[PDB]
Every structure is written in structure tokens, then in C-alpha cells.
Design a binder for this molecule. Structure first.
Ligand SMILES: OC[C@@H](Nc1ncnc2[nH]ccc12)[C@H]1CCOC1
Ligand SMILES: [Cl-]
Length: 167
């Protein structure tokens, strides 16, 4: 039993809800919130900009130190940093950004990072401003993640389309 509320159960381990991931994280304070990161951990827009804003830019300050020490992430890769006021930890995961010409096959590699954590609150990787098809992102999530994932979909119209088209 965990404190996630109002989710539709898609499979044994995947759950989905129309929700603002920022507001969800503040309410649940999960062990792990997933950020839709880029390799530079520059949290400007989309989920990343919203999460970073909610931390009063502390996420960005921490991230800049991480990059100065370690260099950029790989597309498909991840790092664990603080969750600040939103969660215990933030798993920054880089899905491919189609608007940059990155290989969509890397989406599966990106979701594999979730398997290192027993329970996560997450967005759909590569969706929104990363330009991939969200129906595809959900399919890859369900077929790749084996740990318990609670997906927040910000857009209600998209949420309804995601549920009604789910196989
Ligand atoms: O990963 C892309 C998604 N973006 C977010 N998801 C959840 N919470 C969010 N807050 C701000 C942006 C954001 C798209 C895909 C479906 O719905 C929005
Ligand atoms: Cl987005």
C-alpha cells in the first residue's frame, strides 16, 4: 500500500492519472519523482521547468554543480539527485527529443532507468515538448518498466485519449 490516489490501473505495475506532476509530488512527497531532463540538466520548460520552478531554482543550482563535475548525461541515461521539497529523490531521465533529431529507439533505454527504483512518480518520457507520440511513450513504458510507476499526464484531453486508446 502507498499513498497514490485516483489512478487508473493499466497493468500489474503501471498506473495513470490526469494530474500536474508538480502538485502530485507536493501532495505525495514520493520517494522518487522522475524529471524529463536533457543531457545538460538545463530545466527550462516542460516538466523540467515546472519542477525546477517549484524548488525555487534549487534543482537547477544542484544540477549545474552535477554537470560541472560529471559532464552531460547520455540520451537514454539518468542520474539521481535530490528531490528538494518535492520528493526524497529526483531521477533525471533523458528521453530522446524528436525536435532535436534524436533516435526514438532510445526511449526504451530511457525507461529502463525506472527499473532501478521500486516505486516512481513520473511523466511520459519524450512526450510534450520532446516531440514524440505519447501513445507510443505509454506503450514503451508498459513494455519496459517492471517496477511500480505512477504516471501523471498534465493534459486532460491527452489523458482521456491515452486511456481510451490503451491496449
Ligand atoms: O512528458 C511530457 C508531458 N508533460 C508533463 N506531464 C506531467 N506533468 C507536467 N507538468 C508540466 C509538464 C508536464 C505531456 C504528455 C502528456 O501530458 C503532458
Ligand atoms: Cl511537456
Amino acid at each position: 500500500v502507498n499513498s497514490f490516489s485516483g489512478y487508473l490501473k493499466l497493468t500489474d505495475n503501471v498506473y495513470i492519472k490526469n494530474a500536474d506532476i508538480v502538485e502530485e509530488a507536493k501532495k505525495v512527497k514520493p520517494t522518487v519523482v522522475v524529471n524529463a531532463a536533457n543531457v545538460y540538466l538545463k530545466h527550462g520548460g516542460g516538466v523540467a521547468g515546472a519542477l525546477n520552478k517549484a524548488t525555487n531554482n534549487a534543482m537547477q543550482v544542484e544540477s549545474d554543480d552535477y554537470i560541472a563535475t560529471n559532464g552531460p548525461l547520455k540520451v537514454g541515461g539518468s542520474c539521481v539527485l535530490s528531490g528538494h521539497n518535492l520528493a526524497k529523490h529526483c531521477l533525471h531521465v533523458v528521453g530522446p527529443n524528436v525536435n532535436k533529431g534524436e533516435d526514438i529507439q532510445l526511449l526504451k533505454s530511457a525507461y529502463e532507468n525506472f527499473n532501478q527504483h521500486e516505486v516512481l512518480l513520473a511523466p511520459l518520457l519524450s512526450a510534450g515538448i520532446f516531440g514524440a507520440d505519447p501513445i507510443h511513450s505509454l506503450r514503451v513504458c508498459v513494455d519496459t518498466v517492471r517496477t511500480n510507476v505512477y504516471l501523471a499526464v498534465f493534459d486532460k484531453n491527452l489523458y482521456d485519449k491515452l486511456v481510451s486508446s490503451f491496449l
